Amino acid sequence: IAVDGPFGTASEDVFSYEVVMLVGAGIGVTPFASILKSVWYKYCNNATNLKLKKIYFYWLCRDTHAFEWFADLLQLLESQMQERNNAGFLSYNIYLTGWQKTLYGRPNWDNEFKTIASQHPNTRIGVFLCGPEALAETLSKQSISNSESGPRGVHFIFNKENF
Note the residues at the interface with Ni ion (CB under 5 A): 1-2, 5-7, 153
**Residue type present at position 7:** F
**Surface-to-core class of residue 16, CB atoms within 10 Å of its CB (0-12 exposed, 13-18 middle, 19+ buried):** middle
Alpha helices by DSSP H, 46-108:
68-83
- Return the number of the residue (109 or 156) whose C-beta is nearest Ni ion: 156
Give the C-alpha separation, 132 to 114, whole Å.
23
Q: Shortest gap between Cβ of 68 and Ni ion (angstroms)?
A: 7
Eight-state DSSP code of residue 26: G
Q: Shortest gap between Cβ of 147 and Ni ion (angstroms)?
A: 8
Give the C-alpha separation, 69 to 140, whole Å.
29
Q: Shortest gap between Cβ of 90 and Ni ion (angstroms)?
A: 19
27 assigned to a ligand binding site: yes
106 assigned to a ligand binding site: yes
H-helix or E-strand containing 145?
helix 133-145
Task: Measure the N-to-C terminal CA separation of the chain; round to a whole number of Å.
Answer: 13
Q: Shortest gap between Cβ of 15 and Ni ion (angstroms)?
A: 10
Pick from 31, 13, 17, 91: which is nearest to 56 by CA? 91
Annotated binding site for NADPH: 27, 62, 97, 106
